[PDB]
Design a protein around this motif. Structure first.
Motif, mmCIF file in Angstrom:
data_model
loop_
_atom_site.group_PDB
_atom_site.id
_atom_site.type_symbol
_atom_site.label_atom_id
_atom_site.label_comp_id
_atom_site.label_asym_id
_atom_site.label_seq_id
_atom_site.Cartn_x
_atom_site.Cartn_y
_atom_site.Cartn_z
ATOM 1 N N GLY C 99 39.623 127.166 134.757
ATOM 2 C CA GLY C 99 39.180 125.801 134.951
ATOM 3 C C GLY C 99 37.979 125.458 134.097
ATOM 4 N N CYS C 100 37.853 126.133 132.952
ATOM 5 C CA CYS C 100 36.673 125.964 132.111
ATOM 6 C C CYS C 100 36.557 124.541 131.583
ATOM 7 C CB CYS C 100 36.704 126.964 130.955
ATOM 8 S SG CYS C 100 38.226 126.944 129.989
ATOM 9 N N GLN C 101 37.685 123.918 131.242
ATOM 10 C CA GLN C 101 37.696 122.589 130.647
ATOM 11 C C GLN C 101 37.970 121.488 131.664
ATOM 12 O OE1 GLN C 101 40.390 122.624 127.264
ATOM 13 N NE2 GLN C 101 38.656 122.762 125.849
ATOM 14 N N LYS C 102 37.733 121.746 132.952
ATOM 15 C CA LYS C 102 38.002 120.730 133.964
ATOM 16 C C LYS C 102 37.129 119.497 133.760
ATOM 17 C CE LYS C 102 37.321 119.907 138.905
ATOM 18 N NZ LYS C 102 35.877 120.201 139.118
ATOM 19 N N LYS C 108 38.035 113.083 128.599
ATOM 20 C CA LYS C 108 39.057 112.584 127.686
ATOM 21 C C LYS C 108 39.892 111.494 128.346
ATOM 22 C CE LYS C 108 39.891 116.278 124.451
ATOM 23 N NZ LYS C 108 40.841 117.325 123.986
ATOM 24 N N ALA C 109 40.204 111.661 129.633
ATOM 25 C CA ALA C 109 40.946 110.636 130.357
ATOM 26 C C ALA C 109 40.136 109.352 130.490
ATOM 27 C CB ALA C 109 41.355 111.156 131.733
ATOM 28 N N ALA C 110 38.830 109.473 130.741
ATOM 29 C CA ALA C 110 37.987 108.288 130.860
ATOM 30 C C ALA C 110 37.909 107.530 129.541
ATOM 31 C CB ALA C 110 36.590 108.682 131.336
ATOM 32 N N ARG C 115 39.849 103.201 125.757
ATOM 33 C CA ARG C 115 40.460 102.895 124.468
ATOM 34 C C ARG C 115 41.770 102.136 124.642
ATOM 35 N NH1 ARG C 115 40.037 108.393 121.657
ATOM 36 N NH2 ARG C 115 37.857 108.536 120.974
ATOM 37 N N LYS C 116 42.546 102.482 125.673
ATOM 38 C CA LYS C 116 43.786 101.762 125.934
ATOM 39 C C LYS C 116 43.522 100.309 126.304
ATOM 40 C CE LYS C 116 47.832 102.663 128.744
ATOM 41 N NZ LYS C 116 48.912 101.885 128.075
ATOM 42 N N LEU C 131 32.785 102.607 124.995
ATOM 43 C CA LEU C 131 33.084 103.947 125.467
ATOM 44 C C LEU C 131 32.045 104.395 126.492
ATOM 45 C CD1 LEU C 131 34.320 105.895 122.322
ATOM 46 C CD2 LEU C 131 35.546 104.409 123.912
ATOM 47 N N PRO C 132 32.403 105.339 127.364
ATOM 48 C CA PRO C 132 31.435 105.831 128.352
ATOM 49 C C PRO C 132 30.246 106.504 127.684
ATOM 50 C CG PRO C 132 33.670 106.456 128.954
ATOM 51 C CD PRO C 132 33.733 105.943 127.552
ATOM 52 N N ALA C 133 29.092 106.401 128.339
ATOM 53 C CA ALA C 133 27.871 106.989 127.811
ATOM 54 C C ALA C 133 27.964 108.511 127.799
ATOM 55 C CB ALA C 133 26.664 106.546 128.637
#
Lengths: 57, 60, 165, 170
Positions: C99-102, C108-110, C115-116, C131-133
């Motif tokens: 779960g290192c990249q949790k 990336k989803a945010a 972006r969508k 984009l998010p801070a």
RNA sequence: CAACAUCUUGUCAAACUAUGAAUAAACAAAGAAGAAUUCUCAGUGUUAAAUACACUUCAGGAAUUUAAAU
RNA sequence: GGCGGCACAUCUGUUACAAGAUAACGCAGGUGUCCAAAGAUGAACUCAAUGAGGACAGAAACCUCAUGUAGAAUAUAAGGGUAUAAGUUCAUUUGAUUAUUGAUUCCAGUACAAUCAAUAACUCUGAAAUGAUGGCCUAACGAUCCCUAAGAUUUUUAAUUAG
RNA sequence: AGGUAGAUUACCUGACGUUCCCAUCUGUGUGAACAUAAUGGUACUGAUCAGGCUCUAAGCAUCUUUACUUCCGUGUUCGGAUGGGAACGGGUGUAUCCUACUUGAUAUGAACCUACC
């Protein structure tokens, strides 16, 4: 397709007709014609609903 | 004449002089001992694309 | 002075978790590993066949190959003054989904969600969302007011020494 | 329509064991009397711990057999009538079973031989209720309830009705 | 009496342990070469067949946005 | 120094310091074996112990019920693992076989040895999915030269007929 | 509501009792044949006469156990650093990290696909 070996069906001994007859209720049909030959109360107890429904052996 | 058997003294200092040589990126991209079918799929496609590309170069 | 056995000093390392003996989970064999995933090597002593070396316990690695019963894992090993690449083939009973990249994956989803929307706003003329801070360490807190209507005061002074006997 | 018909205490197993300290010949004879007594061949038993004080770990020692149903009823009648239905109140286990032992196998007197000699036998009666299968089935093996399970006094009343034999409290 | 059960009490373990730190160890925080999306899309194979799925320079190709991610 | 011992090849726990490495003629022990079954597979069963009962029979013989997380057993030293089993019983069988790769452990990233992941055969067990390239895991061992056994019929050719 | 297959593997276990079965499940009847063993007890097969008696499932209790929460307690211990104190032994102050046992409160399961009521 179900992988299997034909050494555990109702045959695996005797022959195909032994398996085929059991597929057609041969053992049930021969039970009544034997049970009726011996007794009547025994035949009624084991096949009570078969007699009422009118299913001949 | 007994001696001192072993010591780790000054061994971490020695190891960090020219520090831990990381492997290059080419080390992570090896494909020896991979799946046999996966390798066959890749070789089959690479031969298909190569032949098509070389045929177009041959025509001109 | 120890011996050079393969599984030396595993009285506590290779012991099963308390009340964690017997069979393992079913999701252990049902989890679908793909090349490029992050995994954690966790030697399960209950399965003596194909048990990885005790040095790789707890190491995090990357899946590099998938085989019918074993999953290829590629971890980094430290040698005299260099680092080498270790390639292993480990059954799923000894690896675990890392779960290192949790935290990274949800960022990336945010961003992809924002972006969508920026492709739903620019063509339709509405101003585009930013984009998010980025993450920052705990910054110095700013000035603020504290109301004096719901406040209370408790004095603090050194405590007189009281014996425990 | 009351469900008392499902609590009818009945015999489910009767075990007769001939435990001798020697292997061979005598055991081949003690097993032969149980084949005549019950009609089915018994099973030999081997020692569990070897002890030189008893002159006995892979050698056959005893020979027991279990009979159930109507067959066990008459064998119990023969065994009980030897004791003349005189069973002490201390012979009933807390689990609802009871047992006793005999010294001479009465067997048959027409064709009797000194080669077979005299053997002593024990009787153990295991009662049950209709519904005890839940602990013996292969799939979904469970535990019988406390109220469904028998007790020492539940076996006493059954024994004092189907055979009318009184129980001594001496 | 003792003994055996059961509830308390005082003190212990480098070759006892349920629990378990501080310091540490190995990852991630955007390199098939700095992202993403849309359209199009092929060869093998998995598969009951696949338009799913796997690998193929995130096969390949073209546009739009884009230098952002302690 | 000698005498004693092997800390000389080697395995287990601890010293040892919650990654890896790791000292003493430190501590408690262990190896140079054993197995046609104690290998492989399928099925059935559950062990030690305690309580209550049964002729001899008693503290220890065999039988029955209940409770029974392994307190038993697993060839061995110790530590790990194991309950519709890896333990016990039964049944079949020889995968304890041939050929080719790529890795991991001491590693100088040499050899030996061991640990694995696949492919191509021919098979064992099972209804089947699977399992099987020796023993549940960590010790049970060996270069150059020499001697002594096993293997290289697959295919490629020459000569003579017919086209 | 129930049954089949499950995933999480005690909030799911264990003990004392309690509640229905209308369908289903179970227990229940039988032993001729497949097949089973010393025993139709197990397993196998044939059936439906009765029963909610045990199962199974749902709930009760100052219930053991188990899982979360505060407290224990910033207490034990710990990283850095004196020409700090003590004859030793051991133990400060500073800038930091901070368990465990125990006791008290809460809960006693959540959740997926298919059929039938």
């Amino acid at each position: 397709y179900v992988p299997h070996s034909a050494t555990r069906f109702a045959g695996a001994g005797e022959n195909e007709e032994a398996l085929r007859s059991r597929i057609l209720g041969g053992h049930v049909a021969a039970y009544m014609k034997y049970l009726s030959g011996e007794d009547a109360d025994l035949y009624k107890k084991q096949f009570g609903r078969f007699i009422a429904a009118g299913i001949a052996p | 004449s007994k001696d001192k058997n072993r010591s780790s003294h000054n061994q971490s200092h020695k190891a960090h002089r020219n520090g831990f040589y990381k492997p290059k990126k080419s080390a992570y991209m090896s494909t020896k001992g991979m799946n046999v079918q996966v390798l066959k799929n890749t070789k089959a496609q690479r031969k298909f694309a190569l032949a098509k590309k070389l045929e177009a170069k041959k025509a001109a | 002075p120890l011996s050079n056995g393969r599984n030396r000093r595993t009285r506590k390392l290779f012991k099963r978790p308390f009340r964690g003996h017997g069979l393992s989970n079913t999701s252990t064999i049902l989890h679908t590993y793909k090349v490029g995933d992050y995994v954690t090597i966790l030697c399960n002593s209950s399965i003596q066949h194909g048990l990885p070396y005790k040095a790789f316990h707890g190491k995090t690695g990357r899946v590099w190959n998938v085989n019918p019963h074993a999953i290829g894992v590629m971890v980094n090993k430290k040698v005299n003054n260099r680092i080498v690449v270790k390639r292993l083939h480990i059954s799923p009973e000894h690896i675990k989904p890392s779960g290192c990249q949790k935290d990274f994956l949800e960022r990336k989803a945010a961003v992809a969600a924002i972006r969508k929307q920026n492709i739903q706003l620019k063509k339709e003329g509405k101003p585009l969302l930013p984009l998010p801070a980025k993450r920052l360490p705990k910054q110095p807190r700013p000035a603020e007011l504290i109301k004096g209507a719901d406040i209370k005061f408790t004095t603090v002074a050194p405590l007189k020494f009281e014996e425990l006997y | 329509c009351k469900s008392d018909v499902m609590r009818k205490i009945k015999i489910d197993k009767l075990v007769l064991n001939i435990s001798v300290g020697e292997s061979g010949d005598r055991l081949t004879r003690a097993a032969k009397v149980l084949e005549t007594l019950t009609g089915q061949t018994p099973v030999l038993s081997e020692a569990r711990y070897t002890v030189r004080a008893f002159s006995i770990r892979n050698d056959q020692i005893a020979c027991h057999v279990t009979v159930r149903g109507a067959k066990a009823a008459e064998i119990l009648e023969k065994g009980l009538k030897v004791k003349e239905f005189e069973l002490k109140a201390n012979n009933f286990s807390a689990t609802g079973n009871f047992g006793f032992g005999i010294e001479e196998h009465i067997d048959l007197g027409l064709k009797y031989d000194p080669q077979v000699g005299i053997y002593g036998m024990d009787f153990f009666v295991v009662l049950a209720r209709p519904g005890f299968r839940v602990s013996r089935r292969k799939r979904m093996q469970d535990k019988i309830g406390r109220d469904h399970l028998l007790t020492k006094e539940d076996a006493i009343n059954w024994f004092k009705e189907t055979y009318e034999g009184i129980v001594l409290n001496k």
